[PDB]
Symmetry: C2
Subunit: 57 residues, 2 copies
C-alpha cells in the first residue's frame, strides 16, 4: 500500500539523516585526533634531533 510505503520511507529518511550525522562527527573526530598525532610525531622528532645533537660531539 502506497500510504504505508511513504510511512516506512519517512522512517528510513530519519535513520539516514542520522548516519550522515554520525559520519560527519566521525570525520571531525578523525581530524582532531590526526592533529594531535601530528604534534606528537613532530615533538618526538625534535626529541630525536636532541639526541642527535648530544651524540653530535
Amino acid at each position: 500500500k502506497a500510504e504505508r510505503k511513504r510511512m516506512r520511507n519517512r522512517i528510513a529518511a530519519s535513520k539516514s539523516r542520522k548516519r550522515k550525522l554520525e559520519r560527519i562527527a566521525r570525520l571531525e573526530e578523525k581530524v582532531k585526533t590526526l592533529k594531535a598525532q601530528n604534534s606528537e610525531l613532530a615533538s618526538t622528532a625534535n626529541m630525536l634531533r636532541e639526541q642527535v645533537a648530544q651524540l653530535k660531539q
Copy 2:
C-alpha cells in the same frame, strides 16, 4: 508576498546544501592530508633514529 518569500528560500536552500557539501569535502580532504603529513613525520623520525644510530 508570501509566495516570493518561498521562492527565495528555495534558492537559499540550494546554496546551504551546496556549502554543506563543500564543507564535508574539506573535512575529507583534511583527513587525507593530515594522514600524509603523519606519514612524513613518522618516517622522518626513523630517518633521525637512523641518524642517531650512525652516532654509536
